[PDB]
Tab-separated table of N, CA and C in Angstrom:
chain	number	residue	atom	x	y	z
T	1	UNK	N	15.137	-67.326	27.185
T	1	UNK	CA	14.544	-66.874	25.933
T	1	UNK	C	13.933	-65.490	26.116
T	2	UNK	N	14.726	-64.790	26.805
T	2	UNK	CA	13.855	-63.386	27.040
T	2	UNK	C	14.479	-62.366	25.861
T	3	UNK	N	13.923	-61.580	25.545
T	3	UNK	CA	13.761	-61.178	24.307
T	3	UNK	C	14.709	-59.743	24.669
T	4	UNK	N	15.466	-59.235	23.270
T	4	UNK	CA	16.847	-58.297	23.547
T	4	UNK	C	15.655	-57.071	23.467
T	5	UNK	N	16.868	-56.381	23.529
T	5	UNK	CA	15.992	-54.269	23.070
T	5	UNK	C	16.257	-54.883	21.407
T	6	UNK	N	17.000	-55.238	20.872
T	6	UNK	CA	17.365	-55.061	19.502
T	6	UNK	C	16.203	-55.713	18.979
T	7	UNK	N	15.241	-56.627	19.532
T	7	UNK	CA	14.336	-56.964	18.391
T	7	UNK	C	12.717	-56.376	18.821
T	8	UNK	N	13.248	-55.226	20.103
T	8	UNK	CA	12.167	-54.286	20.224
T	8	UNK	C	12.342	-53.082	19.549
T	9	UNK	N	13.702	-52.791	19.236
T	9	UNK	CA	13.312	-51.503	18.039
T	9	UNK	C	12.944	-52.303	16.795
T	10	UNK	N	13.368	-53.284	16.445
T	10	UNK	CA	12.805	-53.680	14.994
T	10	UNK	C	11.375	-53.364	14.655
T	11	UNK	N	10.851	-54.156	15.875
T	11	UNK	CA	9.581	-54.325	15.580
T	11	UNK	C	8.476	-53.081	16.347
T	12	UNK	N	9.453	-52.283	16.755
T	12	UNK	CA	8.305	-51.097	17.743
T	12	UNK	C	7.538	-50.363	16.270
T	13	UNK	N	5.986	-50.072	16.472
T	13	UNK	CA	5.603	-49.223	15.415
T	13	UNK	C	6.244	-47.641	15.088
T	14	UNK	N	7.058	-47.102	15.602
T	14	UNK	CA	7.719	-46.063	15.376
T	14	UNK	C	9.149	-45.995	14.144
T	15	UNK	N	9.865	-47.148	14.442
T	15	UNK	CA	10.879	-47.692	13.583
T	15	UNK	C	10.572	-48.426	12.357
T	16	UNK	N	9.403	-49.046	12.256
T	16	UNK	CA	8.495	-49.104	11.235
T	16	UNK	C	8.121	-48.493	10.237
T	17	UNK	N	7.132	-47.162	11.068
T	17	UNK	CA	6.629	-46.034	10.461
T	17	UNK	C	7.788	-45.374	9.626
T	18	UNK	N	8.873	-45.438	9.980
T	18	UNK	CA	9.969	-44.508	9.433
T	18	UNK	C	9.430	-43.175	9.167
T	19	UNK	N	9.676	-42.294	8.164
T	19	UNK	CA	10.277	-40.862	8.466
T	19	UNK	C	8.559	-40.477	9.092
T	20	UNK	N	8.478	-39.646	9.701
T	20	UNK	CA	7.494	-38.580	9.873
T	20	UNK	C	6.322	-37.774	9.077
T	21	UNK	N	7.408	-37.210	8.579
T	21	UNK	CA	6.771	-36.671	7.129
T	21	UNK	C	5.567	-36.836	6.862
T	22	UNK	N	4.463	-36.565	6.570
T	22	UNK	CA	3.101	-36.773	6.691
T	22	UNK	C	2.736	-37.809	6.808
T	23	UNK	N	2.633	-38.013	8.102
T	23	UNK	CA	2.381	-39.728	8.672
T	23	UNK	C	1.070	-39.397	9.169
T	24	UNK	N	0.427	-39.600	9.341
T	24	UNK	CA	-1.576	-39.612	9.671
T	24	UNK	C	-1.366	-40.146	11.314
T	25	UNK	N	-1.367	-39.719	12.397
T	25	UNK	CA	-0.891	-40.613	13.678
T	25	UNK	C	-2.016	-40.267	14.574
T	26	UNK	N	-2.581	-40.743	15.278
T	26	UNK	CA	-3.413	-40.571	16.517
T	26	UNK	C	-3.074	-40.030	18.206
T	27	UNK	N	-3.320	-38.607	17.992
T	27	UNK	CA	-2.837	-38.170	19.299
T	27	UNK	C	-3.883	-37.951	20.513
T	28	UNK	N	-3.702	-37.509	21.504
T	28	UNK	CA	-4.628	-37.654	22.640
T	28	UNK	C	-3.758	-36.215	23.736
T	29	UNK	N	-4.725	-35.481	23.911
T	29	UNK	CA	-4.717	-34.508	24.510
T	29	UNK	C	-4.723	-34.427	26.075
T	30	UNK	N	-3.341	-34.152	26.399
T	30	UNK	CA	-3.404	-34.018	28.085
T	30	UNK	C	-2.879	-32.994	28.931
T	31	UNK	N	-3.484	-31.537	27.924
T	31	UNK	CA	-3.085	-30.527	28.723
T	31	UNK	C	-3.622	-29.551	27.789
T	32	UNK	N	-4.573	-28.602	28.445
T	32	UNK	CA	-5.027	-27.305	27.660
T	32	UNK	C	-4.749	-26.254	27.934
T	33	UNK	N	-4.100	-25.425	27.669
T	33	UNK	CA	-4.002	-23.902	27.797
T	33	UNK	C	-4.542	-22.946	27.010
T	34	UNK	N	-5.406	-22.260	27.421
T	34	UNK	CA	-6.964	-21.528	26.848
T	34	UNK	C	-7.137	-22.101	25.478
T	35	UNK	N	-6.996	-21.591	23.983
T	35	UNK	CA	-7.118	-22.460	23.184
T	35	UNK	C	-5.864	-23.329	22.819
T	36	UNK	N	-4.747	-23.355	22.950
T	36	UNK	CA	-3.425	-24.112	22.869
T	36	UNK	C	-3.863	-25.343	23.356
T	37	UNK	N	-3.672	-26.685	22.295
T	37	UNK	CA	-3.500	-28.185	23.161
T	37	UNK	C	-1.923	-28.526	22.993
T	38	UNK	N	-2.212	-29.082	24.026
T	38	UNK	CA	-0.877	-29.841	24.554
T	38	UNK	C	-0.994	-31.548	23.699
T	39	UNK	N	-0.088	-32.198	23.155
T	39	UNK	CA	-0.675	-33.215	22.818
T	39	UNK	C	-0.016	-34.164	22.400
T	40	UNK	N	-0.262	-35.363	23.055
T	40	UNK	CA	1.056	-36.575	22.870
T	40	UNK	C	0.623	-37.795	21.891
T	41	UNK	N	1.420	-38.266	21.385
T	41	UNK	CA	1.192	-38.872	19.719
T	41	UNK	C	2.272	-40.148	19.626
T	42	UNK	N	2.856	-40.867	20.861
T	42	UNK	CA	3.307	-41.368	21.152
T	42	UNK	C	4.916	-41.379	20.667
T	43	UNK	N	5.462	-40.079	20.638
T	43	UNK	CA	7.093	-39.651	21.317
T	43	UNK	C	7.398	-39.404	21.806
T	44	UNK	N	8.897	-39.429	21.669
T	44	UNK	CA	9.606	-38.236	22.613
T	44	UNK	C	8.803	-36.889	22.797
T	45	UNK	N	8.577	-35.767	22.133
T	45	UNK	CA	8.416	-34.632	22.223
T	45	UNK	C	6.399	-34.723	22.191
T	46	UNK	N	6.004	-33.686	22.588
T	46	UNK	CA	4.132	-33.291	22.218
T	46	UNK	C	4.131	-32.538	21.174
T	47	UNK	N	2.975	-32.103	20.780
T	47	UNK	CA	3.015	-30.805	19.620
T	47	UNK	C	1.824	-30.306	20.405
T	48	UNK	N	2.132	-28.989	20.380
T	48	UNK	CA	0.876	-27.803	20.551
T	48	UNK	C	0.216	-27.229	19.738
T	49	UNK	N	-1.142	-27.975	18.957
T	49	UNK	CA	-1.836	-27.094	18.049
T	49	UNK	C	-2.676	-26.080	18.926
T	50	UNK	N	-3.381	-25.407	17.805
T	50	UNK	CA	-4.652	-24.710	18.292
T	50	UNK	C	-5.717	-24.875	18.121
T	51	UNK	N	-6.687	-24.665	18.546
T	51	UNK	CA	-7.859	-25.098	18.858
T	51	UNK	C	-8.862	-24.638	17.701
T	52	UNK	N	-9.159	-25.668	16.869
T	52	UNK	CA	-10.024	-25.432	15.964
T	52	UNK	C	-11.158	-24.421	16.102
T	53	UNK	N	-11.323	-23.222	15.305
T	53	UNK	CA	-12.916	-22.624	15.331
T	53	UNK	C	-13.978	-23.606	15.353
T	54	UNK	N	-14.167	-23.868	14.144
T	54	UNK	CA	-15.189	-24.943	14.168
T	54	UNK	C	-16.065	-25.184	14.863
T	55	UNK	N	-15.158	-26.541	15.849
T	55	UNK	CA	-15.609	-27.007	16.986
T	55	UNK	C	-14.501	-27.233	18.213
T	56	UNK	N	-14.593	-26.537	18.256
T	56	UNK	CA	-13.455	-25.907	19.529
T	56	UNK	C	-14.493	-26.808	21.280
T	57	UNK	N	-15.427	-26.737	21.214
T	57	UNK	CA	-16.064	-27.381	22.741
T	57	UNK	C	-15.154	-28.773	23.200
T	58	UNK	N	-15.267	-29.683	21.441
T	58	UNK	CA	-14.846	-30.977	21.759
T	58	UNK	C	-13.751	-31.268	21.881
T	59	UNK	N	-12.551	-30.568	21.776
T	59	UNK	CA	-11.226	-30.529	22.234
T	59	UNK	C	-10.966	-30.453	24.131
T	60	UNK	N	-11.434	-31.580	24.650
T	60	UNK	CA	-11.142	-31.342	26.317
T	60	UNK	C	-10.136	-32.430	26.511
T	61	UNK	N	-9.516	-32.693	27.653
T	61	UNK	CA	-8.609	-33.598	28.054
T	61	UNK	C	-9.003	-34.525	28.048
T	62	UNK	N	-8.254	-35.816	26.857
T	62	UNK	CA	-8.265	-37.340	26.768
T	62	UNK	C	-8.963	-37.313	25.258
T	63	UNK	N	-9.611	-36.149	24.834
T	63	UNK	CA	-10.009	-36.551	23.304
T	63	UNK	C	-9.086	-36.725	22.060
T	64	UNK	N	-9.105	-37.952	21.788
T	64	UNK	CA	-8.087	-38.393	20.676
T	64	UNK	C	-8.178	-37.842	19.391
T	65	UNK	N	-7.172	-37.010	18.608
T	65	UNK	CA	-7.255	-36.140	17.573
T	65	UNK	C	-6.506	-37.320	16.362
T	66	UNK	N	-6.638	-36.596	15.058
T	66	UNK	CA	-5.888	-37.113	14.002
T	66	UNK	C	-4.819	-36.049	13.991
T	67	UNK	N	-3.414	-36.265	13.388
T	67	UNK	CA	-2.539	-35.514	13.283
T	67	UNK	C	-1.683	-35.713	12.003
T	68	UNK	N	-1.424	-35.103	11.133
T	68	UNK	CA	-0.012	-35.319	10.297
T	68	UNK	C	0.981	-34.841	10.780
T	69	UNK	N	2.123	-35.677	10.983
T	69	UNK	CA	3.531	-35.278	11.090
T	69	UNK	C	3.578	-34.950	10.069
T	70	UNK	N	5.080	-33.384	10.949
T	70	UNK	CA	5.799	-32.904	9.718
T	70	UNK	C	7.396	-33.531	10.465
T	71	UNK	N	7.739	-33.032	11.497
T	71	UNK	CA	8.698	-33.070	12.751
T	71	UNK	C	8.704	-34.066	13.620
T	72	UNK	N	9.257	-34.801	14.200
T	72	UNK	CA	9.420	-35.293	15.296
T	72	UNK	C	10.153	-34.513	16.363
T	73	UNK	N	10.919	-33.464	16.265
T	73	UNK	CA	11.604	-32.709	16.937
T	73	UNK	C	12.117	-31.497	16.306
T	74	UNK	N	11.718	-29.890	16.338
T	74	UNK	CA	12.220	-28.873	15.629
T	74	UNK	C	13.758	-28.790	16.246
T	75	UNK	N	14.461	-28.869	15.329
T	75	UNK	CA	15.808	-28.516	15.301
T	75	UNK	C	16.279	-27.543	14.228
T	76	UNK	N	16.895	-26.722	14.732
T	76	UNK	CA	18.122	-26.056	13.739
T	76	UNK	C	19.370	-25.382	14.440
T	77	UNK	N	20.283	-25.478	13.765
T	77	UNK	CA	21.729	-24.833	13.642
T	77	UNK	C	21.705	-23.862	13.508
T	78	UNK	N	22.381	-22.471	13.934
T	78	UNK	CA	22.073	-20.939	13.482
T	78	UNK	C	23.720	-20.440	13.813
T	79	UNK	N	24.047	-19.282	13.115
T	79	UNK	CA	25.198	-18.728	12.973
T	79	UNK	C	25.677	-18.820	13.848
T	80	UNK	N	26.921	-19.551	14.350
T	80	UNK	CA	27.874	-19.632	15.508
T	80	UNK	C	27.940	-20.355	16.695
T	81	UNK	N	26.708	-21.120	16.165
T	81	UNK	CA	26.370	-22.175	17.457
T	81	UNK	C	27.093	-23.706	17.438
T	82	UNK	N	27.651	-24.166	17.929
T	82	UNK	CA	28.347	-25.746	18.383
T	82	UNK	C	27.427	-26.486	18.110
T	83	UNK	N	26.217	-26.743	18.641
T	83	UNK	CA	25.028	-27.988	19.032
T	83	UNK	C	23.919	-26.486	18.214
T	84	UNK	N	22.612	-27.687	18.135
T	84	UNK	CA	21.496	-27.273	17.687
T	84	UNK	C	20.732	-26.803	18.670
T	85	UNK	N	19.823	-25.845	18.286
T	85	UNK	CA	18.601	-25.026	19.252
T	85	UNK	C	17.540	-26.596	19.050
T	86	UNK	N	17.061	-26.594	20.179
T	86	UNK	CA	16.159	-27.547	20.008
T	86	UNK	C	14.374	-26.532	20.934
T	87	UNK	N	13.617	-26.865	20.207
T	87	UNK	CA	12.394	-26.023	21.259
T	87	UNK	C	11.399	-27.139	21.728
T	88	UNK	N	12.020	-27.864	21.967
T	88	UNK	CA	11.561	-29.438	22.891
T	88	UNK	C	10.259	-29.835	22.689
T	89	UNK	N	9.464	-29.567	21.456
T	89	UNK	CA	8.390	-29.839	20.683
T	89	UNK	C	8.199	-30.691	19.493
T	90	UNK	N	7.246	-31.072	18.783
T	90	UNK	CA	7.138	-31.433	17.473
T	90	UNK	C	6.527	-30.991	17.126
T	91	UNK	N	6.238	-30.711	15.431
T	91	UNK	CA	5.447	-30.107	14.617
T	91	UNK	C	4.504	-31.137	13.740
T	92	UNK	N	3.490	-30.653	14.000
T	92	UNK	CA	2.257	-31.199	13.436
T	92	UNK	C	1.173	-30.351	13.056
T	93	UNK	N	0.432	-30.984	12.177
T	93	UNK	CA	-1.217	-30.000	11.869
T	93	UNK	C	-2.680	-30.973	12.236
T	94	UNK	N	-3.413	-30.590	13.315
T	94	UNK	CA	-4.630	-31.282	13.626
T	94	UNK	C	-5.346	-31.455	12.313
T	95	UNK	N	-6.142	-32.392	12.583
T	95	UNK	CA	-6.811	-32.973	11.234
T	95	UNK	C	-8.144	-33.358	11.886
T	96	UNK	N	-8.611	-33.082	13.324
T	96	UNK	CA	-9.908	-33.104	13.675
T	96	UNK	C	-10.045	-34.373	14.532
T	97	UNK	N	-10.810	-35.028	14.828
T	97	UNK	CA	-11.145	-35.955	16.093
T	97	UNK	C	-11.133	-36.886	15.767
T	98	UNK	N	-10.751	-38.192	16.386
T	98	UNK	CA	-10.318	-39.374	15.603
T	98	UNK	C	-12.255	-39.897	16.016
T	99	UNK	N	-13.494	-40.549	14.936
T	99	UNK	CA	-14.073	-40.806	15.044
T	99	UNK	C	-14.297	-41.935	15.382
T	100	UNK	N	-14.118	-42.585	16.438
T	100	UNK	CA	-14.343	-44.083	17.097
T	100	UNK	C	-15.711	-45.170	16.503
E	1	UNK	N	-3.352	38.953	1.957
E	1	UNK	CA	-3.321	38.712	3.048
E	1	UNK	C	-4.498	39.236	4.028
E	2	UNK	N	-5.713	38.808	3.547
E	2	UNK	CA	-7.086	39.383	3.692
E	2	UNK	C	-7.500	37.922	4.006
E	3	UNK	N	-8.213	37.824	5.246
E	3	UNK	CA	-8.760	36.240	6.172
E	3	UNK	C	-10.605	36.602	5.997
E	4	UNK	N	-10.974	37.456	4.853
E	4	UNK	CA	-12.777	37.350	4.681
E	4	UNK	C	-12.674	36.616	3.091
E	5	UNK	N	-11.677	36.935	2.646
E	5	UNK	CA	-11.449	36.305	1.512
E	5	UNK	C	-11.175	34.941	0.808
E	6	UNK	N	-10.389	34.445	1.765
E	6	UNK	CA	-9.726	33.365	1.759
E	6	UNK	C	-10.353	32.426	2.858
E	7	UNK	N	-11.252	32.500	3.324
E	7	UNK	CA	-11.873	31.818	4.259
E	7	UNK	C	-11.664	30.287	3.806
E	8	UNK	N	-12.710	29.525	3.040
E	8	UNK	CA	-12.927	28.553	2.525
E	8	UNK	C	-10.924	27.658	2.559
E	9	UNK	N	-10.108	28.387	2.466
E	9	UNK	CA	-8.960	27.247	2.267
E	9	UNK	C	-8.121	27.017	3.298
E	10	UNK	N	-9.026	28.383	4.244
E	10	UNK	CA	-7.635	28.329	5.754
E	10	UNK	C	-8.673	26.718	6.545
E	11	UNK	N	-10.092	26.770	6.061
E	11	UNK	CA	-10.451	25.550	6.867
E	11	UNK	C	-10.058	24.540	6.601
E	12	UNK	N	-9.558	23.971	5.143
E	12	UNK	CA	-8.668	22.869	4.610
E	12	UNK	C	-7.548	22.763	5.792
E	13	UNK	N	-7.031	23.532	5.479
E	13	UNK	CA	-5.384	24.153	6.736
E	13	UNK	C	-5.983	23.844	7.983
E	14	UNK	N	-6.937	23.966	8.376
E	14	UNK	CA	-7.083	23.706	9.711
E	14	UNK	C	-7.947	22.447	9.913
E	15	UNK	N	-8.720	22.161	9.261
E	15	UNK	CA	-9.675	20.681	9.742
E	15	UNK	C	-8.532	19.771	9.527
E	16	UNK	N	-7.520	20.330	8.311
E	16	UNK	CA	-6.395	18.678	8.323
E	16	UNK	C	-5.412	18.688	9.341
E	17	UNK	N	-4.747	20.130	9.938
E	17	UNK	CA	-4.130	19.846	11.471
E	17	UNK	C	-4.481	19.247	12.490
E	18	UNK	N	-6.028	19.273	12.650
E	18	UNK	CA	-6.753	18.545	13.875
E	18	UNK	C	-6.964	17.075	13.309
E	19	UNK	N	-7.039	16.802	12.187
E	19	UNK	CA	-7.524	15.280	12.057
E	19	UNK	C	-5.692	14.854	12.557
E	20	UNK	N	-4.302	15.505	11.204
E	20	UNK	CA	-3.091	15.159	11.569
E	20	UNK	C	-2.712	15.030	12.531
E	21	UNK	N	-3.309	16.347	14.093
E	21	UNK	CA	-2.808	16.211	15.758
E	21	UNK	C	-3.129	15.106	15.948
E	22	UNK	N	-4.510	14.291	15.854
E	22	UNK	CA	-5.098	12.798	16.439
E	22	UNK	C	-4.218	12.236	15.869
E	23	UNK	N	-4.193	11.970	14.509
E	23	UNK	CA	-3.353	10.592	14.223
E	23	UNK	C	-1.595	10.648	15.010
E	24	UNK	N	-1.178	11.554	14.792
E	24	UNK	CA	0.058	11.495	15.836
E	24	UNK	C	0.043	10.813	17.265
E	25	UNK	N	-1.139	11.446	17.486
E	25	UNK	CA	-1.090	10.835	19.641
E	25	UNK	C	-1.555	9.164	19.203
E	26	UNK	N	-2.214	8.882	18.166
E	26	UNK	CA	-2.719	7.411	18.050
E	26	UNK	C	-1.639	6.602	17.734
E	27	UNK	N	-0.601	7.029	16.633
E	27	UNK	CA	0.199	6.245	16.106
E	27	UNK	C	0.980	6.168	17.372
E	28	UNK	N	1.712	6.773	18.658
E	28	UNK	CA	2.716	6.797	18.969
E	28	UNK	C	2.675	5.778	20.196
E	29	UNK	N	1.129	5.799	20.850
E	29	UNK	CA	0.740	4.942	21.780
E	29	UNK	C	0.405	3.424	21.205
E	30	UNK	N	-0.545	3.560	20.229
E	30	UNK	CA	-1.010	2.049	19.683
E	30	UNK	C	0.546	1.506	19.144
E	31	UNK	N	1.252	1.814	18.419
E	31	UNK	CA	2.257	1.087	18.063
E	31	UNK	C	2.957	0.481	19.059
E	32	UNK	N	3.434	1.037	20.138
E	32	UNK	CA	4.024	0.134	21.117
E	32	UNK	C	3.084	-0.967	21.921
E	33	UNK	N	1.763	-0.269	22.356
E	33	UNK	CA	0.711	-1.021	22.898
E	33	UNK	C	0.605	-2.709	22.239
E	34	UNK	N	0.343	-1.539	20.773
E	34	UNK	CA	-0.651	-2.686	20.217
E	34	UNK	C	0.624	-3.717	19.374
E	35	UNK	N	0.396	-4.762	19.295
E	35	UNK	CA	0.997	-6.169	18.335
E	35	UNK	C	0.276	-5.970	16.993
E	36	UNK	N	1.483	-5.750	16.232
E	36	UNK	CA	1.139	-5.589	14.787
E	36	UNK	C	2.654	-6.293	14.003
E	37	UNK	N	3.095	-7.035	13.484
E	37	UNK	CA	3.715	-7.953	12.401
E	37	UNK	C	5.170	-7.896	13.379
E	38	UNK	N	5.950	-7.578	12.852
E	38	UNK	CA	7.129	-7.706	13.952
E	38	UNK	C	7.106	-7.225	15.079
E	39	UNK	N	7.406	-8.002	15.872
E	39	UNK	CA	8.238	-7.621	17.211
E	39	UNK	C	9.187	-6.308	17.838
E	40	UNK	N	8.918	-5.861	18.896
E	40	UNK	CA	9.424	-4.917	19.420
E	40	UNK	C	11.346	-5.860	20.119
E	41	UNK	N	12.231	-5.124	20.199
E	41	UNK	CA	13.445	-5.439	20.628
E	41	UNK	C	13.453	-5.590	22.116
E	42	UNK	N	12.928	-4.596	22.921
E	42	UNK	CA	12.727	-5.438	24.263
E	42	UNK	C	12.201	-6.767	24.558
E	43	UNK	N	11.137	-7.125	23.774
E	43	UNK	CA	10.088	-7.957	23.518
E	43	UNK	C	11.187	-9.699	22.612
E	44	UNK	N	11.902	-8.864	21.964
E	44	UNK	CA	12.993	-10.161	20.922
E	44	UNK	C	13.784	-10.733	21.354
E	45	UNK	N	14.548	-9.721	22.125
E	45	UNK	CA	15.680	-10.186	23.306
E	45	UNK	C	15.413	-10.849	24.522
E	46	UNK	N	14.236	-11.124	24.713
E	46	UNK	CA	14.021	-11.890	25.852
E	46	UNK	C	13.646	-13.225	25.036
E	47	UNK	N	13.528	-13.324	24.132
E	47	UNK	CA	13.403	-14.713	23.726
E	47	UNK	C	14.735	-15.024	23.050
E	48	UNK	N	15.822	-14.149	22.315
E	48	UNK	CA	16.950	-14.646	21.966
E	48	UNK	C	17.704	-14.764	23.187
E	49	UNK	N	17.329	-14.586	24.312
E	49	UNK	CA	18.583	-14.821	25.903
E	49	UNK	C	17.772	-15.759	26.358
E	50	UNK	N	16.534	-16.746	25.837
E	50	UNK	CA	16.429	-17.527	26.587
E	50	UNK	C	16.674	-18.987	25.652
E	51	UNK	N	17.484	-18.752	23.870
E	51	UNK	CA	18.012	-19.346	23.571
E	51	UNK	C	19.548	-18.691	22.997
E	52	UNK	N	20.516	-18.757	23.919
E	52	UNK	CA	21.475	-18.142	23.587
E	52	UNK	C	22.687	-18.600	22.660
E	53	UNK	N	23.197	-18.345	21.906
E	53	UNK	CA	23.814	-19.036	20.947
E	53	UNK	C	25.595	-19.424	21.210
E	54	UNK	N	26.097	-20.458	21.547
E	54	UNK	CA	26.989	-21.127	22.433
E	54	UNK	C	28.029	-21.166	20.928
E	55	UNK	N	28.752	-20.533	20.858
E	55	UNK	CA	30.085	-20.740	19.879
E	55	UNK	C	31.150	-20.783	21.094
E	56	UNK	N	30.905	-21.897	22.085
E	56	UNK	CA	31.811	-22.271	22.962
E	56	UNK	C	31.693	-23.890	23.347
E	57	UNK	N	32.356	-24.555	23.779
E	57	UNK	CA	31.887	-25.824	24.520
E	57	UNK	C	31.562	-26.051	25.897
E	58	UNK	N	31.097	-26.860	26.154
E	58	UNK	CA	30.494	-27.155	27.685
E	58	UNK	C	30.008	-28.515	28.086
């Protein structure tokens, strides 16, 4: 009775969620470069926002942010190309610190 | 063609050559220096060759 992959994509929260598109998701930061975060939101790809004015202190490694998807992966096709440019990222906009 | 006469307009003629000499030496250095809206082509081409566009297979 051990359980297939097929009724782990059914039920994984990602296949669920369906499209991206301004999805509200909880990410967590594990890599800073001066103000640039690095930041994983549980996909394939991270998104790199920037570091709020605001309050820029509380952005350190492991603080869990709010995020809207736009992307799960930037892709496009451009004049003369076979396969797509991919820039091995996702696109998102921070929405500030997830308040616990 | 008398310079006691005409005083007052040769300094127009001349205070605006010296302000015009500065802005020349400023524009010619800050523009390459400085980052202002588009991109320089040395600067473009190193990011279009590090995604190069494949109208071939592989």
């Amino acid at each position: 009775n051990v359980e297939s992959f097929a009724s782990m994509l059914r039920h994984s929260p990602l296949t669920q969620m369906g499209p991206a598109k301004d999805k509200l998701v909880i990410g967590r930061i594990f890599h800073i470069v001066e103000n640039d975060l690095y930041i994983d939101f549980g996909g394939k790809f991270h998104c790199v926002c920037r570091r709020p004015e605001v309050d820029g202190e509380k952005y350190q490694k492991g603080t869990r942010v709010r995020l809207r998807l736009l992307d799960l992966e930037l892709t496009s096709r451009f004049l003369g190309a076979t396969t797509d440019t991919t820039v091995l990222e996702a696109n998102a906009v921070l929405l500030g610190i997830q308040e616990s | 063609f008398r310079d006691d006469a005409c005083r007052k307009e040769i300094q127009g003629f001349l205070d605006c050559a010296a302000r015009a000499q500065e802005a020349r030496k400023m524009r010619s250095i800050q523009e390459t220096l400085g980052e202002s809206g588009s991109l320089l082509p040395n600067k473009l081409n190193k990011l279009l060759q590090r995604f190069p566009n494949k109208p071939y297979l592989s």
